[PDB]
Design an enzyme around this catalytic site. Structure first.
Site, short mmCIF file in Angstrom:
data_model
loop_
_atom_site.label_atom_id
_atom_site.label_comp_id
_atom_site.label_asym_id
_atom_site.label_seq_id
_atom_site.Cartn_x
_atom_site.Cartn_y
_atom_site.Cartn_z
CB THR A 186 -0.94 0.04 1.22
OG1 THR A 186 -1.85 -1.07 1.17
CG2 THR A 186 -1.76 1.33 1.28
CB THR A 187 1.89 3.96 -1.67
OG1 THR A 187 2.85 2.90 -1.80
CG2 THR A 187 2.63 5.26 -1.36
CB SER B 278 4.38 -1.56 2.16
OG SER B 278 3.53 -1.48 1.03
CE1 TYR C 127 4.17 -8.36 -0.75
CE2 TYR C 127 5.86 -7.10 0.37
CZ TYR C 127 5.35 -8.31 -0.04
OH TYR C 127 6.01 -9.48 0.27
#
Ligand code: MG
Lengths: 212, 235, 195, 222, 240, 233, 231, 204, 244
Positions: free
Chosen positions: A1-2, A131, A170
């Site tokens: 995820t961002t 992440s 990810y």
């Protein structure tokens, strides 16, 4: 995820990726990581997907009840604190949450609150969670100014997610953009990272390490 | 003394019948349902000229598609409104949709008979619940402290109710416009009110599919009162 | 959070508290104020587990503000510290204890004396001329033991505090992003905006 | 120590068409290396033109389906026989699942039907109730074998138009119900070949404006 | 627990326990509220049947709920303390969760809600108290004045009085208070408030209390001498 | 959470053209000790249902009492208790399945695997499984524990799918069941020679056979087997 | 008189006046009719309006696919009791995979109503119910009184002027019981029965309410133009 | 980790001829870190003295608790509590927390106002009474104190001789303990005068 | 059921009065007179025991004056048993405050707490109110010497001089006549005893019919001492002031 969100002259930019993984397995590339709490407030989703979904939709219900009772738009401060107080009651039980509650009101102006499942509630100008947060911070910190235009600010948010999507295994799929104004948020489209990467590489001259 | 949940020899609950008498003493509220919308209007009835009349809140929003007017012991209505608002919002949370006007009304009416020796007495207030949903269109309900609710094309509650209802009997037809309904509520309120009707002692509101529930400005109502006066002088 | 210092001089109490807020790998903020004003002449700084720190501090603030309104009177620093200690002493045997350490700096208007109280999350209270929580004392106490005088001015206290912060910035592994300094005296609470 | 969870294997697949939707699943039920049943229905008609499957731990799967069917019943009672729309059903299921956030239904749930505009719809849930509307979703044991194939053959991913060499993508043309069923059958045939828990039979439920129809196909029994 | 329904309807549709609670308010000392252009003044009657009183420590009639809102009352004194305490707790709870002090309307709505609850809960009697709640909303310079009563109804007032002989002072206010031009200064507002109490009070000595609330948490209670100067000036103009 | 103490092994069953057959041995094991030799693990409910239970015996005895209580309760204010409103196999199963899942959901399971065999009002064969986890499934053949691994393969050679059921007579089905019980006696270290067998037929009703024994056993070939490799004597 | 202040008090002649007063509320209610054959069971109800602007109060409530009732008296009490029946029908299906017998449904209603007649603080239910259903023993019709008395019948009527319909059904007993496999004729007999209780008013399109359940017929309610066929 | 040795500290009590003595160190620490040199561990309620070692938060809590209880005792009884009675109250109060105890080592000392008899007592963290004639020890250097007291003590010491004995017992015990020291206080208690003396000792 | 026998202790009369509170006040009017007088250098509490006997053990007896803590005392008028219930609650409240804040409870905070307890019995619970009126005499470092009274309604007020119990109308007039603001404790002692001597229903005021107490800063330097007078000490002060 961002996920990221930052304050500027023209309000708030919210930008997120779209990838969800179970171990090394890519479960989904089409995850909506910006929750539309109501027409004026936005929340980002990191950590537990269900926890963020469930409790930020619930937050929307509490905000609606507030403005029905008080005949006035809820403040970003009050809305964020409803959520942080709720998750603090569940502290220890295993809720997983890292979110930015974003809004633009008369009394506050553009406001962002980082809310956490350990009970943390922080007001700030730039936040980046997931992440791939460290990659996005780099692009943000070196290019951020308060006096960015809405057009440039939108691109900066898009470019920062792209930076993370490239390096973080990810993060990826597609980029969702939002612009939060006082009259409400405005959606600025879904952008496939695959197509966006090559487009940005050519037009910007960046990513010379990659062969295209 | 005697039980709070006691039946009379006629088969009626004493306390419910007595609460209906308190509602008769309340200020007049009127509702008219049309195919263009539902109109809700109330008599404010300030007890003194020093009382700021815009603080009198007898018309209330439950949701964007549901409004409500009250008559009787208006303090009792606050917890009923709270429940209604919570029920409307909760259903949206559980089902990602607007709640049906009838279902909302039924949820409110479930509170009514929860009294005994739960609360100590019935509610001393009647409600006109007006709204719109996709299944049954524009609707107007009358919620009583008995737990019973009737749907109405038009309805008046409060001290001038039977005189107003007889007037609504003659005036309502299935082709009324929203504008015609607005003037009709104003006309009948003016008829049954003690004091002379103006924009400060009376209030209008409506619910439409497009714009939702709206309480009218005093400036907007004042124009409709002037429009009413001229059309009555027109014959 | 990390470093919180306190020093009681002649006529005031000075509290210094770090600005960093680190969530694991990244420093999320570098301007965080780890303090709450309990009453006009009482300030409390805090450090401990995330969430619990602010939750506890605001809970105490609300209670002292409630007392102030009810009695139309400001509680003495000693009284406030005793209230806070009891709350933490109650907390330690709870289902989930508050993991929060505090410093309470106040000016007693009745006695015309500054007062500094140090209380850890167990409810361990001590009145001190200077105090700290965590590892802060390990670096700074040797300097404070040497230079401290009970008749120091506020300006001398700030200079001794600068020397303490400099030693922390030299020998501590973590970057705590400087400190926010606040002074508590007879005129109330004010922030030193250049440090 | 008592372990309240188990794994009954199985694989399910939901695909949303332009004016239809399919929800398919194999009929094999297993524990460890044994077959419990070669025909144990896994996809269910829940009424109101909604089909559902809760794949994973069959006890939790059966419990959830049972409770949702019950929720449809009480939705009719409480709201004047109103039809439960697919989006409303989805939100309702989230609350059923999240209700056991700290002792979850160990299942991956998928529902299918038509939205209020008559277009095909599929919703996908994790064990604790996070959900999303999707065009294409495989669940269960052989999900990792099926999804990449669907990315390529339904969404035409990594496919470009000959002669342009990567410059023009293959256009996303709409698929018929006959075309989708072909892809479903080939997905399960391939999954059966390479996954030990997949086999015996394939049951497909097809949802259109006309109602719910069923189709069954044999799969390899080894 | 004691569950007896004390507040119930009578055949004529009246709740006598609520109505008898109003009779307790009628007995209480007079309280008056007047809002000017940039202030609100709360006046209160002190019955001079009690001398040898220690005025330093005796409970004052006007109470601060927060730094920006005040509450006065007429009726049972012991009952009023319970409402004041609940209001003060709610004011701090609001600051804690909403991060903003209460609006005067919100605080009034809360107190009125408590009063209503006691009219249809088992085993309890209604409060024998009517309240005047005054102040200024945070970051707002518009004066606010509200009234509550045992039934739980509440409303906003340009000026209002409650308690014994409140009918007389309301008569005075209704002819002396102009809405188009309210008391422009603190002086004019206090003068009109003292004048209204002098219609009912008796001696203008230690029988009148005055509290002035201005915007931004500026609340002060006038002393005996300051009020005595208003009393003096009013009657010297009256001798004509 | 507990551990089973006194335990019963495999329960095996299958459908045939006119009904169902179910069988289980009469042993109550105490670990490796073959403690109790006269334990009945098939429990009939009315004249249309037989519930077979494996696993913990104390929990079996509890379930046995629940079923006994279920019959009593069904007869209350029920003039048609022995006719239209009698207990069906499907009612008995659903009740047990509810109990099993509720008990696992409180982390206090009934440590059993259960097979409900019977014939419905309309003559339909009923055969369904439930265990300590609340897991349920149906099949033309069903078996618990070791039976699942050894009996099912043999029973599936007779009825491999649904269409084989009408082609299977009661004589062929009983033969297959009895053979499976012999195989289990050869190979399951927690089995016994003595067993019970129940047939529920839509025409001839419930036939309950007690004190059956495994017979026609092959052991003679053991005499020729010597050593573990190289030994000749 | 002195013995009607609460439900916990017998009179000197052994009467329970609060229960009798609750029974009186039913007599004030609008008429509703119930009747059955061997294949189907029918409810017919005369709905009552407040005035000409108002809707007609609904009288029939569905409890399950195979069961439902009609009401006469306090409508909120019918909602409480019908909700209880819905739950009991539902418990039977979920736990036992079994449709709840109509006779057993009557027993449950009886026992729920009884508890309200023997305890202090409470009050009897102020509604009468006519339950129809089709179960494993065919069609059924029940009459519920808030005293607790539940009775299985071929046909009956409750509410104001119900005596006229009840006499008609008592005459027609031998005819309507034989109406097997013909839903329309059984409803006709019910509409003709309820007509014996009308005065001044007649059966209109928004006045009439009909329900039916049978062998291959789920419990379904007919209102509006769906009952014009029978007017 | 061990609650009874986080903060450190010691208390010792002795009996003499028509007198008792109780003494304590002044250290409070966070394990290795010294935090306070003014943390007194002896309290008094009327003429009854109570020393408390162990977890400091509990030391404070118990002092506040026994002040609370002895104040109510005095209001109701109309007299100050005696050492024998107070000892039972400490025991009762500790045992009521049998399965969630205060991590402390209390020591009672005083002279009965009516009989004039010197009295001392000790407790474990859970309430068991040790009523010794000679001496009582408590804290992180209790072993050291046992060694000192056992050799230095003799019965019927005069007040000013008892002071020297108890002072030397404390000092030398504390100097062999890392978590004790940083100052010391000695109380010399007679039937109607009490003298309090702060001792000079090494500050490491 | 039970409703039949319920007196309904917590209801308003048509005039807006609380029946039971009014009747409890009537009860208190027959109790022995208690007087409190506040001076600049201390407070006096004087109270009359009700028609005693020669066989009553006076030196161990206490029916009027009670100690709440070292700084606050009360004089009782009404049911002694009811008073002791409240007195024990007040003693606990004072200790709770001391434990929490490590400071002695301010006089008004204690008074408000007890008064709030009395109030609760008039609004909810259906129980009879406490038939007790208190005079609180106390000192704290905010307001110094303070006198309060509370009654069964839960209403409390502050006073320079006040009486409760029997003949309060006559007693309050006599106090209002002779009280001055610059008065001292020794003068207040005399006023209190003179007032009781004139208002008493007994033939003569003697030591065995009195309870007496003073709260003085007549404690060596900046601190406060409570003195509950012994029978012999009441006898001496009666001779000193010239009443016997
Ligand atoms: Mg396979």
């Amino acid at each position: 995820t961002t996920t990221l969100a930052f304050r500027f002259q023209g309000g708030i930019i919210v930008a997120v990726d779209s990838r969800a993984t179970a171990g090394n397995w890519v479960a989904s590339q089409t995850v909506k990581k910006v929750i539309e709490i109501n027409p004026f407030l936005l929340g980002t989703m990191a950590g537990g997907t269900a926890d963020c979904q469930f409790w930020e939709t619930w937050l929307g219900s509490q905000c609606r009840l507030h403005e029905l009772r008080e005949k006035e738009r809820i403040s970003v401060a009050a809305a964020s604190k409803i959520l942080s107080n709720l998750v603090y009651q569940y502290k220890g039980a295993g809720l997983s949450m890292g979110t930015m509650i974003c809004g633009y009101t008369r009394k506050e102006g553009p406001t962002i609150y980082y809310v956490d499942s350990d009970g943390t509630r922080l007001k700030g100008d730039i936040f980046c969670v997931g992440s791939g947060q460290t990659f996005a911070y780099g692009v943000l910190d070196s290019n951020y100014k308060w006096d960015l235009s809405v057009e440039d600010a939108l691109y900066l948010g898009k470019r920062s997610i792209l930076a993370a999507a490239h390096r973080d295994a990810y993060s990826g799929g597609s980029v969702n953009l939002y612009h939060v104004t006082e009259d409400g948020w405005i959606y600025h489209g879904n952008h496939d990272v695959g197509e966006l990467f090559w487009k940005v590489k050519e037009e910007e001259g960046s990513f010379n390490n990659v062969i295209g | 003394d005697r039980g709070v949940s006691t039946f009379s020899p006629e088969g009626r609950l004493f306390q419910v019948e007595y609460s209906l008498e308190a509602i008769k003493l309340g200020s007049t509220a009127i509702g008219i349902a049309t195919k263009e919308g539902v109109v809700l209007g109330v008599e404010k009835r300030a007890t003194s000229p020093l009382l700021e009349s815009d603080s009198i809140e007898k018309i209330v929003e439950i949701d964007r598609h549901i409004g409500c007017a009250m008559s009787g012991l208006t303090a009792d209505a606050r917890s009923m409104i709270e429940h209604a608002r919570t029920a409307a919002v909760t259903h949206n949370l559980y089902y990602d949709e607007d709640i049906n006007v009838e279902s909302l009304t039924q949820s409110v009416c479930d509170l009514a008979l929860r009294f005994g020796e739960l609360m100590s007495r019935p509610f001393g207030v009647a409600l006109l619940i007006a709204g719109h949903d996709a299944d049954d269109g524009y609707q107007l309900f009358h919620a009583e402290p008995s737990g019973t609710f009737y749907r109405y094309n038009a309805k008046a509650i409060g001290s001038g109710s039977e005189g107003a209802q007889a007037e609504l009997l003659n005036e309502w037809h299935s082709s009324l416009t929203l504008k015609e309904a607005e003037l009709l509520v104003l006309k009948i309120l003016k008829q049954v009110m003690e004091e002379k009707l103006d924009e400060n002692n009376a209030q209008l509101s409506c619910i439409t599919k497009q714009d939702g529930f709206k309480i009218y400005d005093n400036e907007k109502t004042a124009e409709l009162i002037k429009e009413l006066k001229e059309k009555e002088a027109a014959e | 959070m990390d470093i919180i210092l306190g020093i009681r001089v002649q006529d005031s109490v000075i509290l210094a508290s770090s600005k960093a807020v680190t969530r694991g790998i990244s420093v999320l903020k570098d301007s965080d104020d780890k303090t709450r004003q309990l009453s006009p002449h009482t300030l409390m700084s805090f450090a401990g587990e995330a969430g619990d720190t602010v939750q506890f501090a605001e809970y105490i603030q609300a209670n002292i503000q409630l007392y102030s309104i009810r009695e139309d009177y400001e509680l003495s620093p000693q009284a406030v510290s005793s209230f806070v200690r009891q709350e933490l002493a109650k907390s330690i045997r709870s289902r989930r204890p508050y993991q929060v350490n505090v410093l309470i700096g106040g000016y007693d208007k009745k006695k015309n004396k500054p007062e500094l109280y140090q209380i850890d999350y167990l409810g361990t209270k001590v009145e001190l001329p200077y105090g700290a929580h965590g590892y802060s004392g390990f670096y700074t106490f040797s300097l404070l033991d040497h230079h401290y005088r009970p008749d120091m001015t506020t300006e001398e206290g700030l200079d001794l505090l600068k020397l303490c912060v400099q030693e922390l910035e030299k020998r501590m592994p973590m970057d705590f992003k400087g400190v926010i300094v606040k002074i508590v005296d007879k005129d109330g609470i004010r922030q030193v905006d250049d440090f | 120590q008592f372990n309240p969870y188990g794994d009954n294997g199985g694989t399910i697949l939901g695909i949303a068409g332009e004016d239809f939707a399919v929800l398919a699943g194999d009929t094999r039920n297993i524990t460890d290396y044994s077959i419990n049943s070669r025909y144990e229905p896994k996809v269910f008609d829940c009424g109101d033109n909604i089909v559902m499957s809760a794949n994973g731990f069959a006890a939790d799967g059966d419990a959830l389906v049972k409770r949702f069917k019950n929720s449809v019943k009480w939705y009719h009672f409480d709201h004047n026989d109103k039809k439960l729309s697919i989006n409303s059903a989805a939100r309702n299921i989230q609350h059923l699942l999240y209700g056991k956030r700290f002792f979850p239904y160990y299942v991956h749930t998928i529902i299918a039907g038509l939205d209020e505009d008559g277009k095909g719809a599929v919703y996908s849930f994790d064990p604790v109730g996070s959900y999303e509307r999707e065009q294409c979703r495989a669940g269960g044991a052989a999900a990792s074998l099926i999804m990449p194939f669907l990315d390529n053959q339904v969404n035409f991913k990594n496919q470009y138009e000959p002669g342009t060499n990567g410059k023009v993508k293959k256009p996303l043309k709409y698929l018929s119900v006959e075309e989708v069923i072909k892809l479903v059958r080939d997905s399960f045939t391939s999954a059966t070949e390479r996954h030990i828990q997949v086999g015996d039979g394939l049951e497909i439920l097809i949802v259109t404006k006309d109602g719910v129809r069923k189709e069954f196909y044999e799969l390899k029994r080894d | 627990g004691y569950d007896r329904a004390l507040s119930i309807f009578s055949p004529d549709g009246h709740i006598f326990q609520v109505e008898y609670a109003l009779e307790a308010v009628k007995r209480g000392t007079c309280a008056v509220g007047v809002k000017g252009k940039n202030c609100v003044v709360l006046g209160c009657e002190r019955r001079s049947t009690l001398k040898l009183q220690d005025t330093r420590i005796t409970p004052s009639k006007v109470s601060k709920i927060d730094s920006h809102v005040v509450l006065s009352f007429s009726g049972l004194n012991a009952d009023s303390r319970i409402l004041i305490e609940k209001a003060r707790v709610e004011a701090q709870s609001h600051r804690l969760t909403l991060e903003d002090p209460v609006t005067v309307e919100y605080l009034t709505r809360y107190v009125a809600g408590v009063q209503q609850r006691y009219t249809q809960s088992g085993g309890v009697r209604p409060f024998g108290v009517s309240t005047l709640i005054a102040g200024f909303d945070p970051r707002d310079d518009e004066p606010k004045l509200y009234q509550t009563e045992p039934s739980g109804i509440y409303s906003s007032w340009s000026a209002q009085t409650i308690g014994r002989n409140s009918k007389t002072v309301r008569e005075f206010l209704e002819k002396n208070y102009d809405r188009k031009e309210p008391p422009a200064t603190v002086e004019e507002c206090v003068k009109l408030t003292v004048r209204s109490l002098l219609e009912v009070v008796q001696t203008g000595a230690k029988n009148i209390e005055i509290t002035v609330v201005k915007p931004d948490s500026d609340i002060v209670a006038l002393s005996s001498e300051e009020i005595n100067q208003y009393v003096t000036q009013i009657e010297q103009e009256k001798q004509e | 959470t507990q551990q089973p103490i006194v335990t019963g092994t495999s329960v095996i069953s299958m459908k045939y053209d006119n009904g169902v057959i179910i069988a289980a041995d009469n042993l109550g094991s105490y670990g490796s000790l073959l403690r109790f030799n006269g334990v009945e693990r098939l429990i009939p409910v009315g004249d249309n249902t037989v519930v077979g239970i494996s696993g913990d015996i104390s929990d079996m005895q509890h379930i046995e009492r629940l079923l006994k209580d279920l019959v009593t309760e069904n007869a209350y204010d029920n003039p048609l208790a022995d006719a239209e409103e009698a207990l069906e196999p499907s009612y008995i199963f659903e009740y047990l399945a509810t109990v099993m899942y509720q008990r696992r959901s409180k982390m206090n399971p009934l440590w059993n695997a259960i097979i409900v065999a019977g014939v419905q009002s309309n003559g339909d064969q009923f055969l369904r499984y439930v265990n300590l986890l609340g897991v349920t499934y149906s099949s033309p053949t069903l078996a618990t524990g070791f039976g699942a691994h050894m009996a099912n393969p043999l029973l599936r050679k007779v009825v491999d799918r649904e269409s084989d059921i009408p082609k299977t007579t009661v004589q062929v089905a009983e033969e297959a069941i009895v053979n499976a019980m012999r195989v289990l006696y050869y190979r399951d270290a927690r089995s016994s020679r003595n067993f019970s067998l129940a047939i529920i037929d839509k025409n001839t009703g419930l036939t309950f056979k007690k004190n059956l024994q495994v017979e026609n056993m092959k052991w003679d070939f053991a005499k020729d087997i010597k050593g573990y490799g190289t030994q000749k004597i | 008189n002195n013995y009607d202040g609460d439900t916990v008090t017998f009179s000197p002649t052994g009467r329970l006046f609060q229960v009798e007063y609750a029974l009186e509320a039913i007599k004030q209610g609008s008429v509703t009719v119930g009747l059955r054959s061997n294949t189907h069971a029918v409810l017919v109800a005369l709905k009552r309006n407040a005035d000409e602007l108002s809707s007609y109060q609904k009288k029939i409530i569905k409890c399950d696919e195979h069961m439902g009732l009609s009401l006469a008296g306090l409508a909120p009490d019918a909602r409480v009791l019908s909700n209880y029946l819905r739950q009991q029908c539902n418990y039977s299906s979920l736990v036992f995979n079994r449709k709840l017998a109509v006779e057993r449904a009557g027993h449950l209603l009886c026992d729920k109503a009884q508890k309200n007649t023997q305890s202090y603080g409470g009050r009897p239910y102020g509604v009468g119910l006519l339950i129809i259903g089709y179960d494993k023993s065919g069609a059924h019709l029940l009459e519920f009184q808030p005293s607790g008395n539940v009775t299985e019948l071929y046909g009956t009527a409750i509410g104001a002027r119900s005596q006229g319909a009840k006499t008609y059904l008592e005459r027609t007993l031998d005819t309507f019981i034989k109406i097997d496999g013909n839903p329309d004729e059984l409803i006709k007999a019910g509409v003709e029965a309820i007509s014996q209780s009308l005065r001044d008013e007649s059966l209109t399109v928004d006045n009439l309410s009909i329900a039916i359940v049978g062998k291959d017929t789920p419990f379904t309610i007919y209102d509006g133009e769906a009952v014009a066929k029978y007017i | 980790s061990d609650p009874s040795s986080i903060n450190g500290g010691i208390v010792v009590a002795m009996t003499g001829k028509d007198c008792v003595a109780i003494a304590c160190d002044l250290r409070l620490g966070s394990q290795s870190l010294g935090v306070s040199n003014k943390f007194e561990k002896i309290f008094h309620y009327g003429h009854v003295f109570l020393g408390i070692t162990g977890l400091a938060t509990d030391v404070t809590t118990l002092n506040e608790m026994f002040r609370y209880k002895t104040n109510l005792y005095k209001l109701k009884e109309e007299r100050a509590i005696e050492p024998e009675t107070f000892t039972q109250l400490v025991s009762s109060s500790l045992y009521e927390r049998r399965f969630g105890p205060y991590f402390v080592g209390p020591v009672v000392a005083g002279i009965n106002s009516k009989s004039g008899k010197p009295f001392i007592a000790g407790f474990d963290l859970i309430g068991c009474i040790d009523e010794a004639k000679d001496f009582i020890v408590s804290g992180t250097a209790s072993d050291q104190l046992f060694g000192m007291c056992e050799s230095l003590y003799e019965p019927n010491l005069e007040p000013e001789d008892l002071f020297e004995t108890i002072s030397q017992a404390l000092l030398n015990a504390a100097d062999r303990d890392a978590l004790s020291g940083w100052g010391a206080v000695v109380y010399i208690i007679k039937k109607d005068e009490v003298v309090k003396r702060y001792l000079k000792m090494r500050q490491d | 059921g039970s409703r039949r026998y319920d007196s309904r202790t917590t209801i308003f009369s048509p005039e807006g009065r609380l029946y039971q509170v009014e009747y409890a006040l009537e009860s208190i009017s027959h109790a022995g007179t208690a007087i409190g007088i506040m001076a600049s250098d201390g407070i006096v509490l004087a109270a009359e025991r009700k028609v005693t006997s020669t066989l009553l053990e006076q030196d161990t007896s206490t029916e009027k004056l009670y100690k709440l803590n070292d700084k606050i005392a009360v004089a009782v008028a009404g049911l002694t048993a009811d008073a002791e219930i409240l007195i024990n609650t007040a003693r606990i409240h004072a200790q709770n405050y001391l434990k929490t804040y490590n400071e002695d409870i301010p006089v008004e905070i204690l008074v408000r707490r007890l008064s709030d307890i009395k109030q609760g019995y008039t609004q909810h619970g259906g129980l009879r109110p406490f038939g007790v009126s208190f005079i609180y005499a106390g000192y704290d470092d905010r307001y110094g010497y303070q006198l309060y009274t509370s009654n069964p309604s839960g209403n409390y007020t502050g006073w320079k001089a006040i009486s409760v119990g029997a003949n309060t109308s006559a007693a309050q007039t006599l106090l209002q006549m002779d009280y001055k603001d610059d008065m001292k404790v020794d003068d207040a002692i005399e006023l209190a005893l003179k007032t009781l001597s004139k208002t008493t229903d007994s033939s003569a005021l003697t030591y065995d019919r009195l309870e007496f107490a003073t709260i003085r800063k007549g404690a060596n330097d900046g601190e406060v001492y409570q003195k509950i007078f012994k029978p012999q000490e009441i006898k001496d002060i009666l001779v000193k002031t010239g009443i016997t």
